[PDB]
Amino acid sequence: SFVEMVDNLRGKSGQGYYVEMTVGSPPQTLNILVDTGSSNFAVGAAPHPFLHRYYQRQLSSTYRDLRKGVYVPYTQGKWEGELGTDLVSIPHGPNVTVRANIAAITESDKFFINGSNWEGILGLAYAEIARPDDSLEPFFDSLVKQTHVPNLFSLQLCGAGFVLASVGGSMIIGGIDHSLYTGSLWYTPIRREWYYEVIIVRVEINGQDLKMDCKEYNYDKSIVDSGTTNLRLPKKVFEAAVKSIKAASSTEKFPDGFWLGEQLVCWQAGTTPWNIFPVISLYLMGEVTNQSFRITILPQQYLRPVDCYKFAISQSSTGTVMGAVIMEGFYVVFDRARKRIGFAVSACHVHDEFRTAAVEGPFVTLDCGY
Ligand SMILES: CCc1cc([C@]2(c3cccc(-c4cncnc4)c3)N=C(N)N(C)C2=O)cc(CC)n1
Numbered sequence: 001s002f003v004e005m006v007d008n009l010r011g012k013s014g015q016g017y018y019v020e021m022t023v024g025s026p027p028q029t030l031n032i033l034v035d036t037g038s039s040n041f042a043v044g045a046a047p048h049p050f051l052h053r054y055y056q057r058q059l060s061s062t063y064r065d066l067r068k069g070v071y072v073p074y075t076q077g078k079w080e081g082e083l084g085t086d087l088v089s090i091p092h093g094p095n096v097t098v099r100a101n102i103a104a105i106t107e108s109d110k111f112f113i114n115g116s117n118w119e120g121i122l123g124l125a126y127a128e129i130a131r132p133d134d135s136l137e138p139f140f141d142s143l144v145k146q147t148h149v150p151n152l153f154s155l156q157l158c159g160a161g162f163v164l165a166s167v168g169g170s171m172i173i174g175g176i177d178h179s180l181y182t183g184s185l186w187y188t189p190i191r192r193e194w195y196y197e198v199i200i201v202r203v204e205i206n207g208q209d210l211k212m213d214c215k216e217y218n219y220d221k222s223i224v225d226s227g228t229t230n231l232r233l234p235k236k237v238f239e240a241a242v243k244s245i246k247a248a249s250s251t252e253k254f255p256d257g258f259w260l261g262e263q264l265v266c267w268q269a270g271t272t273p274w275n276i277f278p279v280i281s282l283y284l285m286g287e288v289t290n291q292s293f294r295i296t297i298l299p300q301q302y303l304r305p306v307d308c309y310k311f312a313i314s315q316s317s318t319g320t321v322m323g324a325v326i327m328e329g330f331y332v333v334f335d336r337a338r339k340r341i342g343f344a345v346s347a348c349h350v351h352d353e354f355r356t357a358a359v360e361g362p363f364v365t366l367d368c369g370y
Pocket residue numbers: 014015016017035036037038039040042072074111112113121123225226227228229
């Protein structure tokens with residue numbers, strides 16, 4: 001059923017996962033980054049040094065102007081555009097076509113990426129964080145309202161596994177594909193419908209509790225974001241994490257340029273000492289008040305291939321971000337209809353013959369949110 005949706009994702013390590021889409025009439029083929037960390041469908045629609053193709057409104061008989069501009073600035077650069085609607089389809093997705101909002105980006109700074117091979121972004125989060133405001137209905141809402149596609153989608157991000165390494169995965173829209181995971185799916189509630197916000201109740205390095213007030217883990221928030229490469233942690237949690245990881249791997253020594261995630265380290269062909277780095281367990285709030293469950297990730301996940309790797313755990317000023325390197329261990333279900341997110345061991349996750357990524361619960365925790 002979702003057989004046609006299997007392996008419908010591709011990308012370059014560190015530069016996000018994208019799915020093929022068409023926009024307009026006749027269909028204009030574009031690769032669009034799948035992003036759970038935003039809520040705009042925004043596509044390059046003017047020439048750019050990093051873009052080799054873009055959305056051309058005038059070539060589309062079905063385009064309709066909303067006569068309204070949008071301007072989204074931030075720290076690095078920004079993105080500017082003009083709002084409109086057009087017919088939209090996902091060739092290796094459900095067999096439907098939808099009229100959706102489209103932000104045609106006419107100018108931008110440090111937004112696109114050189115060689116990433118995508119030309120736009122599909123924000124899969126909620127209207128509350130849409131630009132310019134929450135009246136601009138996001139793609140998935142339009143898709144559900146207009147078709148009979150169930151209000152749910154799931155992601156299997158598979159990473160590389162053994163020129164930036166290529167990655168693959170699957171976005172199953174409208175259902176759960178049981179051949180994509182093994183064992184049980186565990187659900188944590190979506191605390192609030194803007195980002196895909198969740199609550200982390202504790203974290204351990206090699207079974208060792210960091211022993212923090214759990215408000216620190218979600219300060220000022222925790223989100224599941226496919227549009228973020230790294231596991232990103234609040235400063236206080238980050239320092240304690242690195243310190244613990246440093247200890248466990250202190251049989252070998254690396255420069256703190258590595259620990260700061262901007263310096264690579266290299267072994268040569270199959271000699272990488274995985275067993276020297278500890279596993280990391282995040283406990284997420286369960287559907288029952290005082291329950292939780294844990295997802296455990298291996299060094300194969302938080303050391304990103306560049307045999308050279310970069311430390312894919314970094315510091316945050318905007319709360320915890322569970323990005324690709326965390327999702328790559330699991331099958332992640334965004335159950336919008338029941339306000340929840342399920343985690344299960346992925347049928348594609350990378351691991352060795354002594355350890356393996358895991359989803360295990362329940363654990364009883366006898367206030368953690370901002
Ligand atoms: C409107 C859509 C949008 C998306 C984003 C981004 C984004 C934008 C462009 C590229 C990436 C990216 C993803 N993987 C790897 N390398 C880069 C992410 N997506 C998320 N989740 N994050 C955290 C973002 O910085 C930022 C903004 C500005 C408010 N706006």
